């Protein structure tokens, strides 16, 4: 579920947030996001 | 046979440490 705050669980990684589309660039080997404060931004879909 | 001749390296050889995105 898309655009609604939700508990995820992706891949063992758990947590709360609002999830949605992307246009990032992930390298096939990539599999997580963050940022220069290293938080969990963004989760590849394990069966998407 | 082989040779063992020495060169420089220069700013070579850096891979991702991880799988986590990162941008700018
Ligand atoms: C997940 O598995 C199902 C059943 O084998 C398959 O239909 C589907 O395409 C798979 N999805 C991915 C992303 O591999």
């Known amino acids: ?48 | 046979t082989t040779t063992q001749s020495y060169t420089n390296s220069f700013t070579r050889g850096v891979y991702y440490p991880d799988k986590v995105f990162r941008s700018s």
Do not use: E, H, W, Y
Request: aromatic letters at 10%.
């Open chain 1, 1 to 48: 579920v898309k655009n609604k705050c939700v508990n995820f669980n992706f891949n063992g990684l758990t947590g709360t947030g609002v999830l949605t589309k992307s246009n990032k660039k992930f390298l096939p080997f990539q599999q997580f996001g963050r940022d220069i404060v290293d938080t969990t931004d963004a989760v590849r879909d394990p069966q998407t």
